[PDB]
Amino acid sequence: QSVDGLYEMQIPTNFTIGHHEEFIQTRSPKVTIDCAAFVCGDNTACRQQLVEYGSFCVNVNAILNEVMIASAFNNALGAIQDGFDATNSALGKIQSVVNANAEALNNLLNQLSNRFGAISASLQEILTRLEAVEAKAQIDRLINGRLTALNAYISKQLSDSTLIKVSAAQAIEKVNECVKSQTTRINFCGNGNHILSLVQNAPYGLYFIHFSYVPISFTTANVSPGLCISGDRGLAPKAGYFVQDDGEWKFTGSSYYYPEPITDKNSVIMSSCAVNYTKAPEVFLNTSIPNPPDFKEELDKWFKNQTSIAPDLSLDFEKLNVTLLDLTYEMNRIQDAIKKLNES
Amino acid sequence: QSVDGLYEMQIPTNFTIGHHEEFIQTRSPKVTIDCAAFVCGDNTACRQQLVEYGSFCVNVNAILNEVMIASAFNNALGAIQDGFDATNSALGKIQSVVNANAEALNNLLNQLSNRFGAISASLQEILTRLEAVEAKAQIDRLINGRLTALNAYISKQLSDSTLIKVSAAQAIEKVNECVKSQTTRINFCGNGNHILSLVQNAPYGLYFIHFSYVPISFTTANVSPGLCISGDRGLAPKAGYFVQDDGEWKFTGSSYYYPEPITDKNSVIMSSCAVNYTKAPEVFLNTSIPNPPDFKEELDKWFKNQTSIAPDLSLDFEKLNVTLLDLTYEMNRIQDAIKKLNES
Amino acid sequence: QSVDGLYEMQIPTNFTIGHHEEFIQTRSPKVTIDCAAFVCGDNTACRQQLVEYGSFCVNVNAILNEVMIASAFNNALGAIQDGFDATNSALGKIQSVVNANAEALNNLLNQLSNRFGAISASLQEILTRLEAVEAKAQIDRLINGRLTALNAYISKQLSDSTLIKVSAAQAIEKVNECVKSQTTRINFCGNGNHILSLVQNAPYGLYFIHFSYVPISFTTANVSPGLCISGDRGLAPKAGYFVQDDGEWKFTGSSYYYPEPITDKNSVIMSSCAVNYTKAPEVFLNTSIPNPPDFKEELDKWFKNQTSIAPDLSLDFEKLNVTLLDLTYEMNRIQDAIKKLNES
C-alpha cells in the first residue's frame, strides 16, 4: 500500500568528473564620503554655508569606515511824528519776527534733510539684510534636499556592507567544509558530489576550486515517500526511495542505484501507517511606509499667524493753513494820501 | 573510565511518517516612494516649497527600486510824504517776503507729504517681505522634520530588502539539498530524516513540501562524550554514543538503536585520554549612539552676534523757535495820532 | 592515468577529544532614541525650535523599537489821517497773517515730531523681527546638521539589528543539528567530528558546549581528484581520495585511513575520462555614491534674483527758498522824516 502519493524524482544513473570555479567576496572596498563634494560640489556659496552646518562628516565617516493855526500846526507835528514813530517801531518788530521765523524754517529744512537721509540709509540696510536672508533661505532648501539624498546613500552603502558580512560568514563555512575537510553534501562545495577543493586569495575575497563528480545521466522513477504493508505496519526507506518495479517494490539508494528488493536493512519499521501532516506559518515581509498626519493640521498647532502694518505716516493738512498778505490795497490808499499832500 | 561528564541525550526509539509544508519569501514587492505624498500630502503650501527643494526623489527611488508858517507847512508836507513813502516801500517788501516764505512753506508741506507717503509704502513692502520669510521658516522646519522621518523609513525598507536577499539565498540551498537531491541532515529540509521533497512557485517565493519521518518516540540515556580505558587509551564513539548499560559499555547509533557492545569498529582509538578544552571569544553587538558635543558650544564657533539700532530720528526743537507779532500796541499809538489830527 | 592534477591534502592520522565553548547572540538590546538629547542636549534654544519641528521621534522610535493855508492844513490833515489809517490797516493784516503762518509752522513741527517718532519705532520693530529671523536661521542650520547625523545612526542601528536577525537564524540551525540531533558535518557544531552538545541560555542568546574529537595529527598525501585507467574508463573515489602509493593506487577514506587497494566498492565508474570544467560568474559589490549635478546649475532653475531699493527720500531745496526782510533801510528814511517834522 503506497503511502499518500506525490511520487517522482530524477535518480542518478551515470557520472562525470569536473570542476567548479567560484568566488566569494568577503571584504568591502573602504569608503569615505567627502560630504561637501556629494552635497554641492565646488560652488563656494554652498561651501560657505556648509561650514556652518556643524561637524557633519565626522559621524558620516566614522560610521561607514569603522563598520492859532501855528499852534494847531505844531500840535499836528507832534501827532504826525508819534504816528510815524509808532509805524517805525512796528516795522522793527516785523523785521525781527519775520526774520526769526524765516531762520526757524531754514533750520527745519536742514534738520529734515538729515532725518530723511538717515531714513533712506536705514531702509537700504534693511533691504540688504532682508534680501540676504531670503536668498540664503533658497539655498538652504536646496542643501537640505541634497543632504537627505546623502543619507539615502549612506543607508544603501551600509546595507551592502551588512550583506558582505553575511557573505563572508558563508565563505568561512565553505572553507571549513570544503577545503579543510571533505564533506558529504550534495550540490554544495562546487556541484555534484564533493571530492577535494583548493582555496586561494583574491583581492577582495576567496577564490575556490572545487573537484567533484556530477550526475550526468539519470532516470525517472515514481519514487514513493513510503509504503505500508497491506496490513498495519509502515515502512520508510533509508537513504533511498521505495521504487515500484513491475508492481513490486524494490528501492534504490538515492545517490546511484540498483533496484534492490526491499530487505529489512533498507527500511525503518514505523510505529504507524498514519501520516502526520504539519505546516509552518508564513512570514512575509510586506513592508510599507505610512502616510503621516496632514501637514497643515500638524503645522497649525504651533504656527504663528503674526501680522502687523506700517504706521499711518501721513500729515494732516487740516491744521496746516498757510496764507498770503494782500497789503497792496492799503498801499494804494497810502499812495493816494501822498499825492494829496503834494497838492495842499 | 568515563571521560569528563555532561552526559545525557534523547535517543530515537520509534518513528512516524509525515509532511512539513514550508514557504520562503525570495523576492520583495517593488516600491516607489512618492516623496511629496509622504512628506506633507496635498497641502499646496508644502508643494510650493518642495518643488524648490531639488530632485530629491530621483535618488530615493533609484536606490529603492534598483536594489513863515506856509513855508514850514510845505516843508512838513515834504517830510510827511517821504515818511509815508518809506512806509509804502516797507509794506511792499513785507508783502513780497512774507508771501515768498509762505509759498516755501506750502511747497515743503507738499514735498513732505510725498516723502512720508513713500516711507509708508516702503514700510509695507518690508513688512510683507519679512513676514513672508518668517512664515516660510515655520514651514521649512516642519518639512525637514517630515523628510528626516522619510529617511528613517528608507533605511527600514532597505534593511528588510537585505534580509530578503539573505533569505533567498537560503531558499536556493534548500532547493539544492532537498528537492534536487536527498540530503543527510537532521531536522532540516522539513523535519526528522529527509526522504523526498517538492517545490512549487508562489507569488513571492518558493513553496516546499517535505517528506520525512520523525522520531516520535525516544528514550533517555546517560550518553557519555567518551570513554577511556581504565588505563591510558582513549576511545571516542563513531556516529553514536557510549552508553553505560548495567555498568558496562555498549553504544548506540545516534539515529536509532540497539545497545551494541562496543566493538573495535564502533570507536576511534584516541592519541590520549586528555581533554582539550577550548573557548571562542564572544562578539556581542551592543551598539549605542553617542551624544554629540554641546550644541551651544558648537554653534558659537561661527554664530554671529550681529546687532544694530534704528537711527535717532528726532527733531531738535532747540533750534526751531517760531514766534508772534505783537503789533497791536503800536497800532493803538497810530490810532491815537489819527484822532489827534482830527482835532488840530 | 591521473586525471588533471591539483593534488594534495592533509589527511587525519590520529585524534584528540575536546570541547568547544561558543556563544551566539540571538536578540538585541532594546533602544529608544530621545531625539532631542541626541540632536542638541539641554540648550533651551534648540528645544524651543525642535518642538516646532513636528512629531519626529514618533517614527524614529516606532521603527527602531518594533523592529487859504488853514484850508490846505485841514485838507492835509485829512490825507495824513487816511495815510496813517491805511498803515494801521496794513499792520493789522500783517499781524494776522504772520501769526497764522507762525502757528502753521508750529503745528507742523509737532506733527513732524510724531511722524518721525513713529518711523523710529517701526524701524526698531523691523530690526528686531529681522534680526530674530537671521539668528534662528543660524540655529536651523546647526540643527539640520545634527539631525542628518541622527539618521546616519539610525541606519547603523538598523543594520546591526538585521545582522542579528541573520545570526539568530544561524543559532536555530545550530540548535537543530547539534543539540537536538547528532549531525555529520566537519568543523561545525564545535570543531572536528561532532559527538554531543549542550545548550543553555545566556542574557542575549544561546551558549553552547560542543563535544567532539579533532584530527590532532595528520599526514600529507598527493591525493588525486580522480583517475582514469590507462584506457578509457574513468574512476572517481567514494568518500575518500585516490592515493598513489609507491606508484600504485590505493585510496584512503577521507576521515581516517588505511591505504586500501582500490576495489570496485571504492570508486564510481565514470561515463568518461573527460573533465568538465565550469565557472561561476563573479558578483562583486563595488558600490559607490554618484556626485549629483552641479549645485548652482540646479539652484538657478528656480532661484529668484529679486532685488529692490529704498525710495529716494530727499527734499528738493530748489523749490524751498526762505528769505529775510531788509526793512531797516526804509525805517531810516522814516526816522529822518520824523526829525524833519521836529524842525518845521
Tab-separated table of C-alpha atoms in Angstrom, chain A residues 24 35 118 174 259 338:
chain	number	residue	atom	x	y	z
A	24	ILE	CA	33.075	34.824	-2.713
A	35	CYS	CA	30.173	65.235	2.227
A	118	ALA	CA	19.044	108.702	7.777
A	174	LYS	CA	32.713	26.903	2.670
A	259	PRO	CA	16.560	-1.697	-7.832
A	338	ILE	CA	0.938	161.062	-0.614
